[PDB]
Design a protein around this ligand. Structure first.
Ligand SMILES: Cc1cc2nc3c(=O)[nH]c(=O)nc-3n(C[C@H](O)[C@H](O)[C@H](O)COP(=O)(O)OP(=O)(O)OC[C@H]3O[C@@H](n4cnc5c(N)ncnc54)[C@H](O)[C@@H]3O)c2cc1C=O
Length: 577
């Protein structure tokens, strides 16, 4: 690509929303679209990217930004971790995520109206939540009604391609779930999600469905990988964004210009950073690093919101986890690896997560005096999910998961279940993404501020207790549990649970909100059309725009944001669409 080139649209960051916006805008083959991306351009060529069972091994790989981020910052406890995994490749974090495809609760999306007006509520957003996907049910295992969740887009999705050997696992987990009086549910896509479900995945035929599927075989898309953004090109007199400056592998600075619009899609952490490096952010934060303020945008990098998770591992009877097939080397692994290389069948093509629970835990919360005081203090409404939303997403990963055990060694023997207790409706104040310096090659400073509010600790403790009650007492599954790893979860002591939750928690990998959609610059940084407040020809389309975090894994809302962004761009450029 030649220095100084003009394109109709420039997408900065070839990630999840970025490739969505780019591929959609290229559907007029006459429209020129450029994508600049820090990582490789050929992820479909990388077996670890395309193979679903390899997803966790991508942590700390060359495709992981591997940021340091502060998980918790309380007066009694603070912890910083590395890596906070983020995709560094075309496809962004959709090239290394764990595939689950779930929208979230209608009541939550309706509340986005406070930020985006009526067009950002559940009903208008449903088509955008489905437009990216083509649904498949090859083994004809699920209700025909659910083909509605795919609108026909280039991301193939399916219910998990079930591992045959895990069917006893699945059958005892289901029995245990029902034995605790909690519903089963398969249609979690119409605004309601109460119960245990067979999840859908961005996996089809044993292959990962990443956002790069949007931007291939489209000659009007110029893809420039391996370039690192320096700054957006802003004209102050015009108050207009003209393009972007990037740095190449050889250390050369290139300017690419957009003749219509630039769309910033660098994800929740680098989008606020690049905005700030370009003169759009909190004015004193900018001054403190020698950056001129073009627009005093107080919310840039603020309102970082994520889900905390406390994972825990149980060792289970042999044959009720996949550790011995996929994790440990030997004939069993060689066998399924051999089958995969010939036709991409077998469990090597599995994302290892097939049942997911979305419970409320009201009866656990009610046993805590502090929760009772707080609910009464909120006028009798549950502080976490006052509109009936789930309290947790419980991922039952059917193997020891290194990506959820950041400080314990991998067990040398045995089969395991990794339960990821994900608090999806926390009430802690948000964190922030701040600049370390004006250096584009340094990571922003990242504070997730998990568990700022003690009530989130109480909730997370009870979500662990719920999960333990389910697996140790529930019918059928109670017989499968051999031991706890690496030691007993101290559920008999509230005070020990306090320490355990803080010390064992991690990100569930759903950061949002750092450039949020809003009605004005005093509320957020982009408007309901995703235009940056105070700047012409600049939109943001990624997780940083999300104003209230969905009640589940978030890749579905992030694709929807990209789809809607492209539609609102097309509607404005009528001479092109
Ligand atoms: C472990 C992991 C596990 C999960 N698990 C599941 C899952 O199971 N299901 C689910 O729904 N969500 C999952 N998620 C959340 C879900 O994946 C995430 O929320 C969405 O994928 C987020 O979608 P954006 O579009 O908002 O952000 P993006 O990062 O994709 O794209 C940004 C792009 O910009 C480029 N880029 C950045 N900076 C520069 C720069 N300086 N110069 C030049 N280029 C730069 C950068 O290289 C990248 O290409 C999971 C993510 C992680 C891990 O990140």
């Amino acid at each position: 690509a030649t220095d100084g080139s003009h394109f109709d649209f420039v997408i900065v960051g070839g990630g999840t929303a970025g490739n969505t916006v780019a591929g959609r805008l290229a559907e007029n083959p006459n429209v020129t679209v450029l994508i600049v991306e820090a990582g490789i351009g050929n992820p479909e060529d990388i077996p670890e990217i395309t193979t679903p069972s390899s997803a966790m091994d991508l942590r700390n790989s060359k495709y992981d930004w591997a940021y340091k981020t502060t998980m918790v910052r309380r007066d009694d406890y603070e912890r910083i971790e590395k890596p906070n995994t983020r995709g560094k490749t075309l496809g962004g974090s959709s090239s290394l995520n764990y595939f689950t495809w779930v929208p979230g609760h209608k009541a939550t999306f309706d509340q986005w109206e406070e930020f985006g007006g009526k067009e950002w509520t559940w009903d208008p957003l449903v088509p955008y939540l489905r437009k990216s996907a083509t649904y498949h049910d090859d083994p004809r295992l699920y209700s025909p009604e659910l083909e509605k969740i795919g609108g026909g887009g280039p991301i193939p999705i399916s219910h998990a391609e079930l591992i045959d050997e895990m069917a006893p696992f699945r059958e005892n987990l289901t029995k245990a779930w029902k034995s605790m009086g909690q519903p089963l549910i398969e249609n979690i896509y119409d605004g309601e999600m109460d119960g245990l479900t067979h999840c859908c995945d961005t996996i089809y035929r044993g292959q990962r469905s990443g956002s790069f599927l949007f931007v291939k075989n489209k000659p009007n898309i110029t893809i420039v990988p391996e370039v690192h953004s320096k700054r957006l090109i802003i004209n102050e007199a015009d108050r207009t964004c003209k393009g972007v400056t990037v740095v190449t592998a050889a250390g050369n600075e290139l300017n690419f210009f957009a003749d219509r619009e630039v769309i910033l899609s660098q994800g929740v952490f680098e989008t606020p950073k690049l905005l700030m490096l370009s003169g759009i952010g909190p004015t004193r934060e900018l001054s403190r690093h020698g950056i001129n303020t073009i627009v005093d945008s107080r919310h840039v990098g603020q309102n970082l919101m994520d889900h905390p998770g406390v994972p825990f591992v149980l060792r289970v009877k042999d044959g009720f986890g996949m550790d011995d097939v996929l994790l440990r080397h030997g004939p069993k692994r060689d066998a399924v690896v051999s089958a995969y290389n010939k036709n991409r069948s077998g469990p090597v093509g599995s994302g290892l997560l097939e049942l997911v629970g979305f419970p409320r835990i009201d009866k656990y919360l009610e046993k805590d005096a502090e929760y009772r005081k707080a609910k009464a203090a909120n006028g009798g409404k549950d502080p976490f999910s006052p509109l009936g939303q789930p309290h947790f997403e419980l991922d039952f990963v059917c193997m020891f998961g290194t990506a959820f055990q950041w400080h314990f060694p991998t067990p040398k023997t045995g089969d395991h279940l990794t339960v990821v207790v994900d608090l999806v409706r926390p009430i802690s104040d948000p964190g922030e993404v701040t600049l370390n310096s004006a250096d584009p090659f340094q990571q922003p400073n990242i504070n997730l501020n998990f568990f700022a509010n003690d009530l989130d600790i109480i909730a997370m403790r009870e979500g662990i207790r719920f999960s333990y009650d389910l697996l140790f007492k529930g019918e059928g599954f109670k017989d499968l549990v051999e031991s706890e790893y690496p030691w007993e979860m101290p559920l008999d002591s509230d005070k020990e649970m306090h320490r355990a939750v803080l010390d064992r928690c991690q990100t569930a990998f759903h950061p949002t909100g750092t450039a949020r959609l809003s009605k004005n610059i005093d509320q957020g940084v982009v408007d309901p059309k995703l235009k940056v407040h105070g700047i012409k020809k600049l939109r943001v389309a990624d997780a940083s725009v999300i104003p209230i975090i969905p009640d589940c894994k978030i890749q579905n809302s992030v694709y929807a944001v990209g789809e809607k962004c492209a539609d609102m761009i097309k509607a404005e450029h009528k001479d092109l669409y």
